[PDB]
From Swiss-Prot:
eIF-2 functions in the early steps of protein synthesis by forming a ternary complex with GTP and initiator tRNA. InterPro entries: IF2/IF5, TIF2_bsu_arc, Transl_init_fac_IF2/IF5_dom, Transl_init_fac_IF2/IF5_N, Transl_init_fac_IF2/IF5_Zn-bd. It comes from Saccharolobus solfataricus (strain ATCC 35092 / DSM 1617 / JCM 11322 / P2) (Sulfolobus solfataricus). Transmembrane segments: none annotated. The keyword Repeat does not apply. NCBIfam families: PRK03988.1. Heterotrimer composed of an alpha, a beta and a gamma chain. It comes from the Archaea. Belongs to the eIF-2-beta/eIF-5 family. Keywords: Initiation factor, Protein biosynthesis. GO terms for molecular function: translation initiation factor activity. This is Translation initiation factor 2 subunit beta.
Length: 134
């Protein structure tokens, strides 16, 4: 519950090295004002769909059958199918993990995509990247 808030290297500021921030909890809800998807808590939101920059950005291109506008009054309006679905569906398994897999005794092991350099990092699994052969 106690989300340590330092802002120092959570996202946004391209000063990568010490600290990897933290994601889950604070205002994780887009506003959709007609195909226009205005991302309020964008700093969190980017690393709620995906921390891995490239695939995160690629998803917000591929899911956009519409010309993706960037930014309004400071807050990040994008134009396409990145409006309260997608990222929020992903945070339903990410942020809402404990209820998405409703407390399976202690071990909620059915989270994130166990493929192509993504996988799940600890928590549900004893070791990060539980790829494995059959």
């Amino acid at each position: 519950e106690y989300v340590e808030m330092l802002d120092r290297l959570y996202s946004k500021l391209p000063e990568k090295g010490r600290k990897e921030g933290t994601q889950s909890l604070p205002n994780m809800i887009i506003l959709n004002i007609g195909n226009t998807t205005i991302i309020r808590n964008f700093a969190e939101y980017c690393d709620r769909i995906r921390r891995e920059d490239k695939i995160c950005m690629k998803y917000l291109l591929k899911e956009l059958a519409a010309p993706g506008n960037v930014d309004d009054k400071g807050e990040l309006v994008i134009q396409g199918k990145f409006s309260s679905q997608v990222i929020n569906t992903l945070m339903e398994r990410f942020l809402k993990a404990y209820v998405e897999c409703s407390t399976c005794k202690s071990l909620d092991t059915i989270l994130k995509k166990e493929k192509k350099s993504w996988y799940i990092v600890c928590l549900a699994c004893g070791a990060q990247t539980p790829v494995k052969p059959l």
